[PDB]
Write a protein that binds this ligand. Structure first.
Ligand SMILES: *[C@@H]1O[C@H](CO)[C@@H](O[C@@H]2O[C@H](CO)[C@@H](OC3O[C@H](CO)[C@@H](O)[C@H](O)[C@@H]3O)[C@H](O)[C@H]2NC(C)=O)[C@H](O)[C@H]1NC(C)=O
Ligand SMILES: *[C@@H]1O[C@H](CO)[C@@H](O[C@@H]2O[C@H](CO)[C@@H](O[C@H]3O[C@H](CO)[C@@H](O)[C@H](O)[C@@H]3O)[C@H](O)[C@H]2NC(C)=O)[C@H](O)[C@H]1NC(C)=O
Ligand code: AMG
Ligand code: CA
Ligand code: CA
Ligand code: MN
Ligand code: MN
Lengths: 234, 234
């Protein structure tokens, strides 16, 4: 039937959120995906992911139907400095269960250089790689870091961002909306995605949030997740 | 090539807006679509439309190419009372040039009960007719007051609303986003629309904003347009 988790805030232990690497839960009830310092000294090349414990049912083989989902979350990215040049970004992704971790930096901890695992991600790219358009930008990544579509947006440094991602099985429409209410700005980007086709060998996937800091000293930024709700309708 | 008008504010006698009926420009620099008390005495069954002077090229018959466009505007709807109940709503529409007006009330001043002319509109329905779902709601009307898709939303009485309407020719995706920043709420609705087909006998259309008040007395609400920008890319 339906599957829906909601995190008005975050709490340790909570056997619902599965943390990987640098990901951890601050005392603020905030989920910190990456680290800016570790052990007393500055750090970089940090990586963190937070996957939801339960796998989500994307499509059913029996009746050949597909699930229509909607996920919402608030993030706070802060960029300490200008030069070097902050990196790398944040992403919402989906991957088959027990599927290998992605690379660092530009691969937002989700994709691997050699087409390894079917992965789907919605990125918020802060660093311009050799394959990226001006940044920062929103990108719909379908089995590749090379977004199938992108949209440039102004980032409100240290300001709260509201993200809404919606998928309608019937129309195969994936729409992403980014809002910065304080300043009152709205960014909307949509494309066509066929979940069954992009995830042909998996009726179940693990939903998650991922982020990474740069490959060079000080090519970093903060990646905080305040709240996160999701709901699929198969 | 490209076509783009922008109205951070409205100026009286603006040779770029073709005001019709009750539509007029207040001294605030605000565009008032309907009157709730003309000349001082209350008024009902009001109708107003504001069309952009220049026609917009939707599709090129010589190239087969369709135009992608994006329009943005801020509206302020205020509902004086609960009873009887407010009506009828606001809408963004497109129609072939020198095309007949629509009927009052529930037809948002855009459609004619008996399918007369080709029309496309994005409605913000405040009144529930016999063909409507729980109001208020956003509706994508493709040649009919009977929205092909709708989405319910909570109206912020007298609060500013930010609307973003976007169409991508390449994917045929029409997405509508409604934001109330003060309260921080986001409503997103999208469907598939083929402009070339819904407007087969017109390569040009007139872009506009329309609104109407109810039939019964005191079944009125205000319909104000603060700003309005638009841009098509053929
Ligand atoms: C977005 O994320 C950043 C980083 O997580 C949030 O802010 C940081 O704000 C801290 C204040 O709470 C500030 O520092 C500290 O410094 C003060 C004195 O200045 C001490 O009293 C505290 O004990 C603590 O040591 C951090 O320096 C600052 N980080 C950055 C990179 O600027 C910010 O509030 C978040 N935004 C929202 C809306 O939550
Ligand atoms: C959005 O539109 C709202 C409706 O017009 C508007 O509020 C309304 O505010 C006016 C004040 O300008 C109230 O008016 C009356 O008072 C003035 C003097 O203060 C007189 O000149 C008028 O004749 C009248 O007596 C309206 O009553 C009030 N409407 C309601 C339903 O309460 C908002 O302020 C607008 N918001 C923005 C951002 O423009
Ligand atoms: C020069 O590229 C490398 O470093 C920058 C940081 O400066 C980015 O992190 C990028 O992903 C990584 O491949
Ligand atoms: Ca990048
Ligand atoms: Ca209606
Ligand atoms: Mn990118
Ligand atoms: Mn309706």
């Amino acid at each position: 039937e339906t599957q829906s988790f909601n995190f008005d805030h975050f709490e340790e232990n909570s056997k619902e959120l599965n943390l990987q690497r640098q990901a951890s839960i601050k005392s603020n009830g905030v989920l910190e995906l990456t680290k800016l310092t570790k052990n007393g000294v500055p750090v970089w090349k940090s990586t963190g992911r937070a996957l939801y414990a339960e796998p989500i049912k994307i499509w059913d083989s029996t009746t050949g139907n597909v699930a229509s989902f909607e996920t919402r979350f608030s993030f706070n990215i802060t960029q300490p400095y200008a030069y070097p040049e902050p990196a790398d970004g944040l992403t919402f992704f989906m991957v088959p269960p027990n599927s290998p971790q992605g690379e660092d930096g530009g691969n937002l901890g989700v994709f691997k250089p050699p087409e390894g695992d079917n992965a789907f991600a919605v990125e918020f790219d802060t660093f311009q790689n050799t394959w990226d358009p001006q940044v920062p930008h929103i990108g719909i990544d379908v089995n590749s870091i090379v977004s199938s579509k992108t949209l440039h947006f102004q980032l409100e440094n240290g300001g709260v961002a509201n993200v809404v991602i919606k998928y309608d099985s019937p129309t195969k429409i994936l729409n992403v909306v980014l809002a910065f209410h304080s300043v009152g700005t709205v960014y909307t980007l949509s494309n066509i995605v066929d979940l069954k086709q992009e995830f042909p060998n998996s009726e179940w996937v693990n939903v998650g949030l991922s982020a990474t800091t740069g490959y060079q000293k000080n090519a970093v930024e903060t990646h905080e997740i305040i709240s996160w709700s999701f709901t699929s309708s198969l």
